[PDB]
């Protein structure tokens, strides 16, 4: 006589799995006990971060007239947001290249 199997991601209205993230925190050896709101809050944070980085990648792809985003689009998106660039200052993107940015003295007169 069990109720319908509903999901915590639908409970929070979120896309990232509350269950899998909760399981990873349990077996990631960070504490023996983990409060219930923590995977919900964490999944929301991850979804928010993916929200901007994915929309910026799509916008840069639309600037490049591509409907399929490429790692170049990801690098262009991530280096054009200063707070995200501070977030990933030490991070290498595979096949990402660098921004088009040259020093002023490098250009001719």
């Amino acid at each position: 006589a069990r109720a319908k199997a509903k999901t915590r991601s639908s409970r929070a209205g979120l896309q990232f799995p509350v269950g899998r993230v909760h399981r990873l925190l349990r077996k990631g050896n960070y504490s023996e006990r983990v409060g219930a709101g923590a995977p919900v809050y964490l999944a929301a944070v991850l979804e928010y971060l993916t929200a901007e980085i994915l929309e910026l990648a799509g916008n840069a792809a639309r600037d490049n007239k591509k409907t399929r985003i490429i790692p170049r689009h990801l690098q262009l998106a991530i280096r054009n947001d200063e707070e995200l660039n501070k977030l990933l200052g030490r991070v290498t993107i595979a096949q990402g290249g660098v921004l088009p940015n040259i020093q002023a003295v490098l250009l001719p007169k």
Binding site: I70, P71, R72, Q95, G96, G97, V98, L99, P100, I102, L106
Partner: peptide
């Protein structure tokens, strides 16, 4: 070549 490889990915 700076521009060429800098926009490129390979």
């Amino acid at each position: 070549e700076i521009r060429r490889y800098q926009k490129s990915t390979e």
